[PDB]
Structure to design on (259 residues):
């Protein structure tokens, strides 16, 4: 502190001093131990309906970059899986590393990926986002791992606009982007009850983490690392390593949709 971030002086190990819930019973991310996750045949396939998605803007908030969607109606929703009810997409963002061997927040059998995409949705029964985050089933986040390999064509539009939102507080119009181009071929997943992974750390999230990673090229992820944490005209601090490490599982079970 001063304000939280990912540095040595205000990084995740310090958050508990302003947000005591950091040492809570249902904090995220976690390590997914594949041999201890329970297959649960009662879980339903996920239903991702993003064909009427309306993206609006892309913003650098100082901790990541969010692409925001119009959520005033049921245009891009997730339902099914372990969820009851309809959850509307409000924004996506990424977490990534300064090197390719780190960057994801969840890990799989202790394996870290180069980055992790979060598609954040909120439960329509609560009427708005801000009321959703106060309830134990208020949000559902789909997490997708990224590995370095082949380029992902559907991520290129995002990569290309980054130069225009280089520093904190910058935004740019970002319409007609289709988030379908960011899904792996398979929707197999793990699920557990957890929290937002940045302050205020609220325990209101059902996480849905996809088993299959997407590939991005080295050049693509290289462009993420050119962003800045600082605002314009402040000393440059590249936006890298904006990931929280794995927290204790405590009394929770990870369930798998697959065997
Ligand atoms: Hg996130
Ligand atoms: Hg909550």
């Amino acid at each position: 502190s001063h304000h939280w971030g990912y540095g040595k002086h205000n990084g995740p190990e310090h958050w508990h001093k302003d947000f005591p819930i950091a040492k809570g019973e249902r904090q995220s991310p976690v390590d997914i131990d594949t041999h201890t996750a329970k297959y649960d045949p009662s879980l339903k396939p996920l239903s991702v309906s993003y064909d009427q998605a309306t993206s609006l803007r892309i913003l650098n908030n100082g901790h990541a970059f969010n692409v925001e969607f119009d959520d005033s109606q049921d245009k891009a929703v997730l339902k099914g899986g372990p969820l009851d009810g309809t959850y509307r997409l409000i924004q996506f963002h990424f977490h990534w590393g300064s090197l390719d061997g780190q960057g994801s927040e969840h890990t799989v059998d202790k394996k870290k990926y180069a980055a992790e995409l979060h598609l954040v949705h909120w439960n329509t029964k609560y009427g708005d986002f801000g009321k959703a985050v106060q309830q134990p089933d208020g949000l559902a986040v789909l997490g997708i791992f990224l590995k370095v390999g082949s380029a992902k064509p559907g991520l290129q539009k995002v990569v290309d606009v980054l130069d225009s939102i280089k520093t904190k507080g910058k935004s740019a119009d970002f319409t007609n982007f289709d988030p379908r181009g960011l899904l792996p071929e398979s929707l197999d997943y793990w699920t557990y009850p957890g929290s937002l992974t940045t302050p205020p750390l609220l325990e209101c999230v059902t996480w849905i983490v996809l088993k299959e990673p997407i590939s991005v090229s080295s050049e693509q992820v290289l462009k993420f690392r050119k962003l800045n944490f600082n605002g314009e005209g402040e000393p440059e601090e590249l936006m890298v390593d904006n990931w929280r490490p794995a927290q204790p599982l405590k009394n929770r079970q990870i369930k798998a949709s697959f065997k």
